[PDB]
Design a protein around this ligand. Structure first.
Ligand SMILES: Cn1c(=O)ccn([C@@H]2O[C@H](COS(=O)(=O)NC(=O)[C@@H](N)CO)[C@@H](O)[C@H]2O)c1=O
Ligand SMILES: Cn1c(=O)ccn([C@@H]2O[C@H](COS(=O)(=O)NC(=O)[C@@H](N)CO)[C@@H](O)[C@H]2O)c1=O
Ligand code: NA
Ligand code: NA
Lengths: 420, 381
């Protein structure tokens, strides 16, 4: 949610900033609703003035021994219209709120203005994509060899876009997730958390997936119970820890890390696109003055995972036309994928500003004013575990089809140094 | 599903054995349907044959497993037999606190934030308690893979109906599952246990005799919409480290003893006193022939509480899955036997760790085997 006062009073300036995202604000409808509101409010004011006078004129008519029936009938009619005037103003405000819940965030001034994906800038890249002396295999060819990565058995259980891992590939996947959590808790100042993987609608509305992106979620419809949704990311559960709270300035920043499955009902082959995937999520609840510096740190934390695994990657600053709904500024990390001869997305790191904090009423008590003020929220993958496994399998492949274990993962691989 | 030959050749004995579970086998309806199929065959139309076949198959999928002759005969939980114990429950020199009071002290176990997010029967864990939960699950999976011969697996947590019918949750227990209704697609169900995904790896296959035993281990969330039940004891979501075995039918009752010892080892290494209960015929799970429950000591309750269920399913799930192996003696593809057991339910291990390891000041001492996973933390709070 944007600032309601800003959208209602400056719809033209808000529309112009939003147009950079390709989003066309319904300025004609905001102004029409605002014209209707002003018209009803002026009618209720004139009626309040008329009814109050008539209601007190009954007292005076009584003192004169006069008939009060014409006056009571006037007051009663006026009262009934004021009650409708309230219903009209409530239904106008109701329509305006429903509309404001579907508006994407305002891009920060520093975001490059672009109409599409081609206006995204490379910020920097790290490491050098390996030149192989043999024909590179993809992660599907590599992992299927001994049945350690099995899409057929997963299709037999659950249908398309699911995976089954066994033996050393399953251990390598767990090693990756354990390495990420241990790194963020030991070196990057994040507090570990275990969260529900099923949330009710209010949590998803707090982070921006609801009301607009319901069709992308798996829903559990329940009889006489509030429906449950499978989390698309631990961002939903972690960010909402602070909903409806006034935090002390001393408690900021709150930094959370969670390793959870992620469920989405939205080449893309093998493990690139899945209905379920593990992701180690980083979430920060910060002082608004520090959120853009916090984003730089958050991005460096996700990068550190790739540097430690020695995986060549690239950092992209997303343009205005290529951002997520609730983001003011995003950096995408893209890992080198040898079988594709390109870098592919492995993490998105965003500053949401006060957009999610507004929806969930997550606040802090400002020290200067003493007044409760909205916090800023940030989130970032550090990393999507299945995609890192794809990167590990492909970048560490040997000529015989075996896989070298990355150095930082050997303590988790129980003596295994080469897979197959 | 039960052997169709046994149901036909020995109806009275199969019915008398099932009656020890409190299940009344409808021999009359089964044999009346068999007579109708035989009469319709001698005349052959397709409508009446498919209706009789659909009726018979639906009945057949509703019959629980035959209890093994070594299973104590009883009507309820009070007839379950304690077969052994391990360890001495601790005598505390202060008033014992439950895991809820222990965990809630610094916000590290938070039922209120979880309720705000998801409603009742959910949990949120933070900092050293979340780290201890993760340490427990890592310990269990590292133990089973390194010492007990189990191959690790990452599985889907959403399955379609045939996998649940393969292990016995469907058709009879649909109400206990969280279903995802999918428009113009097969509905998905959240897994109640990794037993569903692990056991079904071998469905529709003829394995090699040399491939047996197949021993799988997985750490997964478990989702169910179903004595003291406070906090993490009962949840809609909980983590469980599951052990599954696909074995030669001749070895399955020795394999159950080995599976039960694997689960027990986690409790021994954590130094958590417990007891082993041989479930009676009237307290057994639908798909089981024989079950041992592990019940860990819970100081706040002054009693042992269930933390694991180890079962031999015989050929029951194999029949539903058509999971076979090529018999080296005969040459014929024969049904395999299947087994599963918790090693362990992670949330309930955490309850047991918090309570048994608590100290006078409300702090919790970290179990010895968990210290390598706790980043220097030896005392929680
Ligand atoms: C397997 N798989 C998918 O099918 C889809 C996405 N991803 C990775 O997940 C990362 C984070 O997803 S996101 O871009 O929608 N952003 C978030 O979820 C925020 N909570 C920040 O993480 C993407 O960068 C993909 O690499 C998959 O792995
Ligand atoms: C939190 N919680 C529950 O809410 C319910 C059960 N349990 C434990 O899970 C163990 C295994 O569940 S079971 O008995 O249904 N058996 C199986 O699922 C098999 N696949 C073997 O694991 C129970 O023993 C409870 O201790 C919870 O922890
Ligand atoms: Na992205
Ligand atoms: Na049980």
């Amino acid at each position: 949610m944007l600032d309601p006062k800003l959208v209602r009073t400056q719809p033209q300036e808000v529309a112009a900033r939003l147009a950079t995202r390709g989003f066309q604000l319904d300025v004609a409808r905001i102004e029409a609703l605002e014209e209707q509101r002003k018209s009803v409010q002026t009618r209720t004011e004139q009626l309040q003035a008329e009814r109050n006078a008539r209601s007190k004129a009954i007292g005076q008519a009584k003192q004169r021994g006069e008939d009060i029936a014409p006056l009571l009938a006037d007051v009663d009619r006026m009262g009934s219209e004021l009650e409708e005037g309230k219903r009209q103003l409530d239904a106008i405000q109701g329509e305006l709120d429903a509309m404001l819940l579907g508006i994407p965030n305002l891009p920060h001034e520093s975001v490059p203005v672009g109409a599409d994906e081609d206006a995204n800038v490379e910020v920097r890249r790290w490491g050098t994509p390996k030149t192989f002396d043999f024909e590179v295999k993809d992660h599907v060819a590599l992992g299927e060899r001994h049945g350690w990565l099995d899409f057929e058995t997963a299709a037999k259980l659950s249908g398309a876009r699911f995976a089954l891992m066994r033996g050393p590939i399953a251990r390598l996947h767990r090693a990756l997730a354990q390495f990420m959590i241990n790194l963020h808790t030991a070196e990057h100042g994040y507090e570990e958390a275990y969260t529900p993987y099923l949330v009710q609608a209010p949590a998803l509305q707090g982070t921006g997936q609801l009301p607009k992106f319901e069709e992308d979620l798996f829903k559990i419809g329940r009889d006489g119970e509030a429906d449950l949704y499978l989390i698309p990311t631990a961002e939903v559960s972690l960010t909402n820890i602070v909903s409806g709270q006034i935090l002390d300035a001393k408690q900021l920043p709150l930094k959370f890390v969670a390793h959870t499955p992620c469920f989405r009902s939205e080449d893309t082959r093998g493990m690139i696109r899945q209905h379920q995937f593990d992701k180690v999520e980083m979430v920060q609840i910060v002082d608004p003055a520090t959120s853009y510096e916090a984003l730089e740190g958050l991005t460096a934390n996700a990068e550190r995972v790739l540097q430690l695994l020695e995986l060549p990657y690239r950092v992209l600053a997303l343009c205005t036309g290529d951002m997520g709904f609730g983001s003011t500024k995003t950096y995408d990390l893209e890992v080198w994928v040898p079988s594709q001869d390109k870098y592919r997305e492995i993490s998105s790191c965003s500053n949401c500003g006060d957009f999610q904090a507004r929806r969930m009423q997550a606040r802090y008590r400002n020290p200067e004013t003493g007044k409760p003020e909205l916090v800023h929220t940030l989130n970032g993958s550090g990393l999507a575990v299945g995609r890192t496994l794809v990167a590990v399998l492909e970048n560490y492949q040997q000529a015989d089809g075996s896989i070298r274990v990355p150095e930082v993962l050997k303590p988790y691989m129980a003596g295994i140094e080469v897979i197959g």
